[model samples]
Target: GVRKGWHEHVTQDLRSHLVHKLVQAIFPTPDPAALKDRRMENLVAYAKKVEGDMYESANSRDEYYHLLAEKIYKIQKELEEKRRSRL
Candidate 1:
């Protein structure tokens, strides 16, 4: 059992030096000058610039709740305290 485990480990572990050489042989060099015809490359690159934030109303409402929560809590607490104090 231990021998079989060692054999599996050796077979599964690919040496990195040979793998780097294999990758270099497999991939072709890029053509940077011919990139003008690449589809959606610019669109993907400038996504944030082209596709600006679209949830202004939703974001504004959500932020408004944060601003009003403390004020509402304070006002309600004071109103309750005032009611309870009035005999």
Candidate 2:
């Protein structure tokens, strides 16, 4: 009966919560380039945990999750640079 799509399972609130957590873990680093790969692992793991809680398997392994994680990683890097510039 678990036929819901990615959008149905992962909500805005859930994603925002994940992003906030990710930012806390990976932000304000001296080297964004060094942290690039690390961010994906953490982001995907966070997504997996969120989805794994609701389903038997972690659908965060799906394409949607990777795409979202990558997008958010890129945006977070951008935001980090912007924030550093501001400071």
Candidate 3:
């Protein structure tokens, strides 16, 4: 059997990192035109990857939770950054 709680912990970390990266990539101040397309593509790809992983691991509730947590974290971070910049 899979290790208990490991999935949740890993998921949290993955989510935090994903959010940080996505925010930096998608919302950099005075963003460069050259990087816009690439960043958008990368952000989209990460979303799809998370979705795929969730579906592929449907048998494991832990995996599903992990993926969800990660995605949420990433999105949350992005929102946080946006809020911060507005202040």
* Candidate RMSDs in order: 26.8, 10.1, 10.0
Q: What lDDT does each candidate get?
A: 0.36, 0.55, 0.56
Model 3 spans with C-alpha error above 4 angstroms? 1-36, 60-70, 77-87
Q: Could you give candidate 3's per-residue lDDT for residues 26-78 as a string of tens digits?
A: 45455457456666677666756755555455445456556655656676567
Higher-lDDT candidate among 1 and 2? 2
Over 1-87, each residue of candidate 2 has an lDDT whose tens digit, in order, gives 565466665677765665454444445355557557766677567756754443333344265455546645676678767778969
| Local error of candidate 1 at residue 71 (angstroms) | 1.0
Q: Which digits, one per residue and each the tens of the lDDT, describe model 1 over residues 4-76?
A: 2222221223423222222222222454564565653553444333222211212343443343344435554
Best of the two (1, 2) by TM-score: 2
What clash pairs does model 3 have? none
Q: Estimate each model's TM-score.
A: 0.26, 0.30, 0.32
Number of clashes recorded per candidate: 0, 0, 0
Error of 2 at 3 (Å): 13
Tell me how far the alpha carbon of residue 65 in candidate 2 is from the true structure, in angstroms, after superposition. 0.8
* Pairs of residues clashing in candidate 1: none
Instruction: Give the winner by TM-score.
Output: 3
